[PDB]
Amino acid sequence: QVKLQQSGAEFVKAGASVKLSCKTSGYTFNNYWIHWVKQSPGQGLEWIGEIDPSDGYSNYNQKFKGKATLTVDKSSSTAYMHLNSLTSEDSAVYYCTSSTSVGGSWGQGTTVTVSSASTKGPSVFPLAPSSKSTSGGTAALGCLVKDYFPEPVTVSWNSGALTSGVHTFPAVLQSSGLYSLSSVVTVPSSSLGTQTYICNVNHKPSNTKVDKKVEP
Amino acid sequence: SDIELTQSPLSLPVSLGDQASISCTSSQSLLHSNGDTYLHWYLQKPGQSPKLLIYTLSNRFSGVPDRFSGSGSGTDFTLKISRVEAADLGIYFCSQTTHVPYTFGGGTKLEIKRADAAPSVFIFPPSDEQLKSGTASVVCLLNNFYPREAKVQWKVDNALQSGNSQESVTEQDSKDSTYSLSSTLTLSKADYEKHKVYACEVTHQGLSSPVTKSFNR
């Protein structure tokens, strides 16, 4: 069973370096080449380079030469990629891949977030229902979860009990370097003030849990 | 320079059980000196890594369903899915490993087709709680629409707002195959207090003409 097991998420400052790793098993490590691939919103999928573990020979995409360095540790059957002089352009998911010959499976990916920001819990603001949020017999309400770092935050509604019509949107990165996200739900218009609505917000990186009631 | 792979279409709506066909063309021949053509097809599901379906043009990767087939002529390539299932939904990528540097196409999204659904549009003024703190976020919600394409335009006392809003969109809904979208307009408390009419104008294929939702503070 070929398994490629990548290291965990990285959060580093511009100018820093990171060493990502990819532990392999279920094939003869020394007989097949390892590749690394970048996936970013800005550039899609990009091949970084390849390394032959047998003699350590490596070959790069000229776009990443001296940005990225490939090595292996044969005792552990682990591949590594060192990334240096990081910029926000390097914030991406990085995959490690095996040869098509051993199945050409890809690791899970490792997310690298390059940022000056420090850990910060969100403020939670209501998005109250009104006439402005009522299309006939359905009303929308929600929570604005603002100014946190890093991702992620979780949001449930009424302590897991409300899930129908919930939309928790992807976070956006604000020009301040902090994230912001909305979670909304549509409900029967007639339920308002009879049924209470609470958004349960959790931001584990800062240990910030908030239950926020949302009413007209 | 580097080999460019161009995929078509960008987005492919299908109904479950339809046949799907996706195209990839190369700016150079992908025939290697060894006689092989190193053009490969991958499927990436949301939050997952790319998975290899077809390698070297037409070789079905061991354990990939028979309904995936690869074809093509040295520079024009095609992936066919004979009976589309829910497991097949996501982004399909072609890639080439004939010539260094290896390169990828831009992806084709295979999504569920449904009837046009106009968005339900809702606008939320900033909360008094937030105003105390010193910022004003105005949120416009476009709920349960299809197709994905939607234009949101913010107006503050008829001043078209540009560069001071951010949008976010959900993945296609499991049940109803719709999208939802939130757009946040960020102002200072000071600026927010200077104006009266906040308007979110929504342009969508499913609407007669663009709808506007506003409030006056």
Numbering used by the authors:
A (entry chain H): 1 to 52, 52A, 53 to 82, 82A, 82B, 82C, 83 to 99, 101 to 213
B (entry chain L): 0 to 27, 27A, 27B, 27C, 27D, 27E, 28 to 211
The authors write:
A luciferase‐based Switchbody is engineered by fusing the NanoLuc luciferase fragment HiBiT to the N‐terminus of an antibody. The enzyme activity of the Switchbody increases upon the addition of an antigen in a dose‐dependent manner in the presence of the complementary fragment LgBiT and its substrate furimazine, demonstrating the potential of the luciferase‐based Switchbody as a biosensor. As the working principle of the Switchbody, we considered that upon antigen binding to the scFv region, a trapped HiBiT is released from the scFv and interacts with LgBiT, leading to the reconstitution of NanoLuc and the emission of bioluminescence.
We employed the scFv of the anti‐human osteocalcin (Bone Gla Protein, BGP) antibody KTM219 as a model antibody due to our familiarity with its properties and crystal structure. We next solved the X‐ray structure of the Switchbody in order to obtain structural insights into the trapping mechanism of HiBiT. Moreover, structural conformations of these heavy chain CDRs differed considerably between Switchbody and Fab alone compared to light chain CDRs and both chains’ framework regions (FRs). These results suggest that the HiBiT is mainly located near the heavy chain CDRs and does not tightly bind to a specific site on the antibody in the absence of antigen, similar to the behavior of the fluorescent dye TAMRA in Q‐body. In particular, the MD simulations predicted the salt‐bridge interactions between D52H or D54H residues of the scFv and K9 of HiBiT. Therefore, one of the key mechanisms for “Trap and Release” of HiBiT would involve the interaction and antigen‐dependent disruption of these salt‐bridges.
